[PDB]
Amino acid sequence: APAILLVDDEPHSLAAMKLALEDDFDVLTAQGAEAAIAILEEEWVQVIICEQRMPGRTGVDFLTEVRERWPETVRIIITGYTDSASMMAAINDAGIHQFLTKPWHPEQLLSSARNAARMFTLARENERLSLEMRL
Amino acid sequence: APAILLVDDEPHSLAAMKLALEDDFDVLTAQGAEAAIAILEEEWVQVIICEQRMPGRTGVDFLTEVRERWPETVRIIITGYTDSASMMAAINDAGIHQFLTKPWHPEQLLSSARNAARMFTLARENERLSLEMRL
């Protein structure tokens, strides 16, 4: 069973988001891009939820690399940040699958996560069928 | 190109949600279960966003019928209603793809919708490959 990885500058938020998710996933938890890549090199993640507004490397810059390296992973930005249009285009340039806002509701967060997981499953099995039919 | 159907008791909310969505979909708009089924019998909808808390027939009761009749359609409940557990189990009994809360943010709503559309596309093409490989 693959994990969900939560990536956020602010550890209180990581531990809150995990409360909403632990009952339904293996939750993995990272405190910035660097830590999160370290985890991605190390194990199997179906879904990532990542704060945009982090020190140093942004959510999208992080997730653009992820889209490059683990293309199968479903990517989600979440931010409480009252919106710049620039952030949106940046999010839109990268293929980000969901944008969520803060504060989040546990049932909405959970539902987004489950929905990202089902999408991971579909894409992955969609690809299995392409490869297999070719043969 | 298939539509998004918004279903809500309260027409102000329908016309607001369409503002967030019109630039990216053909938005269709219904003011209760009955009106919404009438539209579903009549045309092609990839995604439905539907208030739960409607007079007479509920969001889930509506969407359970929809799951029966147009199984390909991606189904979304949205409600400002501060939560009963009963509502959640009911939502969970039916295969509802997203639960959203009110008030909604235009970029989060739009993102949910786009994401439901991509999922409609995947499921639909996932099925096209099953059928075709069988042959």
Q: By what technique were these coordinates determined?
A: X-ray
**Nearest CA-CA partner of B119 in A32, A73, A120, A95:** A120
Integer distance in angstroms from the first to the last C-alpha of chain B?
A: 27
Residues β-bridged to residue A27: A4
Radius of gyration of chain B (CA): 15
The Cα–Cα gap between B72 and B119 comes to 10
A&B contacts, CB < 8 Å = 56
Are B122 and A118 inside 8 Å of each other by CB?
A: no
**Nearest residue of chain A to residue B112 (CA atoms):** A98
Instruction: Report the top-level CATH class of A1-135.
Output: alpha beta
Are A126 and B122 inside 8 Å of each other by CB?
A: yes
Is B41 an interface residue toward A (CB < 8 Å)?
A: no
B70, two tokens: 């147009």
Is B97 an interface residue toward A (CB < 8 Å)?
A: yes
Q: What are the distances in angstroms from CA A6 to CA A41, A45, A69, B27? A: 15, 10, 17, 34
Contact call for residues B17 and B49 (beta carbons, < 8 A): yes
Kindly report the number of other CB atoms within 10 A of residue A51's CB atom. 23
Residues from chain B that touch A52, judged by Cβ atoms under 8 A, are: none
Contact call for residues B100 and B109 (beta carbons, < 8 A): yes
Kindly report the number of other CB atoms within 10 A of residue A78's CB atom. 25
Best mutation target among A60, A111, A129 (most B Cβ atoms within 10 Å) is A111
Contact call for residues B7 and B32 (beta carbons, < 8 A): yes
Full DSSP string of chain B? --EEEEE-S-HHHHHHHHHHHTTTS-EEEESSHHHHHHHHHHS-EEEEEEESS-SSS-HHHHHHHHHHH-TTSEEEEEE--PPPHHHHHHHHHTT-SEEEESS--HHHHHHHHHHHHHHHHHHHHHHHHHHHHH-
Sign of CA dihedral A43, A49, A54, A60: positive
Is A108 an interface residue toward B (CB < 8 Å)?
A: yes
Is B88 an interface residue toward A (CB < 8 Å)?
A: yes
Phi-psi domain of B32 (left: phi exceeds 0; alpha: psi -120 through 50; beta: other): left
The Cα–Cα gap between A39 and B5 comes to 40
Q: What are the distances in angstroms from CA B93 to CA A56, A112, B7, B12, B90? A: 43, 17, 20, 29, 5
Contact call for residues A119 and B119 (beta carbons, < 8 A): yes
Cβ neighbourhood burial of B39 (10 Å; 0-12, 13-18, 19+): middle
B118, two tokens: 């991509």
Sign of CA dihedral B1, B19, B96, A74: positive
Radius of gyration of chain A (CA): 15
Cβ neighbourhood burial of A25 (10 Å; 0-12, 13-18, 19+): buried
The Cα–Cα gap between A87 and B78 comes to 26
The Cα–Cα gap between A127 and A125 comes to 5
The Cα–Cα gap between A64 and A14 comes to 21
B18, two tokens: 């369409």
The Cα–Cα gap between B62 and B34 comes to 9
The Cα–Cα gap between B102 and A13 comes to 22
**Nearest CA-CA partner of B29 in B2, B11, B59, B5:** B5
The distance of Cα B12 from the centroid of its chain, to the nearest Å, equals 18
Q: How far is B122 from chain A (nearest CA, A)?
A: 7
Question: Which residue is associated with the tokens 């489950």?
Answer: A114
Question: Please, which contacts does B126-130 make with residues 24 or more away whose CB atoms are closer than 8 Å?
Answer: B126/A122, B126/A125, B126/A126, B126/A129, B129/A126, B129/A129, B129/A130, B129/A133, B130/A129
Strand ranges, E, within chain A: 3-7, 27-30, 45-51, 74-79, 98-101
**Looking at this protein, which amino acid is placed at residue A43?**
E
Residue A82 is given by DSSP the state P
